[PDB]
Short mmCIF file of C-alpha atoms in Angstrom, two decimals:
data_model
loop_
_atom_site.label_atom_id
_atom_site.label_comp_id
_atom_site.label_asym_id
_atom_site.label_seq_id
_atom_site.Cartn_x
_atom_site.Cartn_y
_atom_site.Cartn_z
CA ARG A 1 -23.84 4.78 -6.76
CA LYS A 2 -20.50 6.31 -7.68
CA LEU A 3 -17.23 5.70 -5.83
CA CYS A 4 -17.36 3.87 -2.49
CA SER A 5 -21.12 3.59 -3.05
CA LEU A 6 -20.59 1.48 -6.13
CA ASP A 7 -19.59 -1.95 -4.87
CA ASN A 8 -17.50 -0.54 -2.02
CA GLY A 9 -15.20 1.06 -4.59
CA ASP A 10 -13.76 -2.39 -5.36
CA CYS A 11 -11.93 -2.38 -2.02
CA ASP A 12 -11.63 -5.49 0.13
CA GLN A 13 -12.16 -3.47 3.28
CA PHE A 14 -12.28 0.25 4.10
CA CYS A 15 -13.33 2.60 1.31
CA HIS A 16 -13.02 6.37 1.32
CA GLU A 17 -13.63 8.95 -1.39
CA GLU A 18 -10.59 11.18 -1.02
CA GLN A 19 -11.39 14.35 -2.97
CA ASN A 20 -13.37 12.39 -5.54
CA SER A 21 -12.02 9.01 -6.65
CA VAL A 22 -11.60 6.03 -4.30
CA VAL A 23 -8.86 5.23 -1.79
CA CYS A 24 -8.87 1.81 -0.12
CA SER A 25 -7.16 0.87 3.14
CA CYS A 26 -7.16 -2.10 5.56
CA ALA A 27 -7.60 -2.96 9.24
CA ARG A 28 -4.59 -3.43 11.49
CA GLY A 29 -2.75 -6.62 10.58
CA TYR A 30 -3.39 -6.22 6.88
CA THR A 31 -1.41 -4.46 4.19
CA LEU A 32 -2.93 -2.94 1.06
CA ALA A 33 -1.97 -5.01 -1.98
CA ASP A 34 -0.11 -3.57 -4.94
CA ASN A 35 -3.39 -2.91 -6.70
CA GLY A 36 -4.32 -0.48 -3.95
CA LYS A 37 -7.50 -2.46 -3.33
CA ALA A 38 -6.96 -5.93 -1.86
CA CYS A 39 -5.89 -6.48 1.73
CA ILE A 40 -3.08 -8.91 2.50
CA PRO A 41 -2.76 -10.49 6.00
CA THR A 42 0.48 -9.66 7.74
CA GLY A 43 0.48 -12.78 9.92
CA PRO A 44 -0.89 -16.33 10.60
CA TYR A 45 -4.01 -15.24 12.51
CA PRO A 46 -5.27 -11.99 10.89
CA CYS A 47 -8.36 -10.34 12.41
CA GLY A 48 -11.80 -11.22 11.11
CA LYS A 49 -10.69 -14.54 9.70
CA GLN A 50 -12.37 -17.76 10.77
CA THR A 51 -9.71 -20.34 11.68
CA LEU A 52 -9.30 -23.34 9.35
CA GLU A 53 -6.23 -24.58 11.29
#
């Protein structure tokens, strides 16, 4: 368990080992946070989120 195999590489979503080392990315409607790991919703109803309101 190295990069993406070790806890998804610490990414919130997509994880890819780009020439060794991890590179996270997000689904459409999300924007990779400053940390290059978390995924921030671009709008009110982002995909994959259960609605609380």
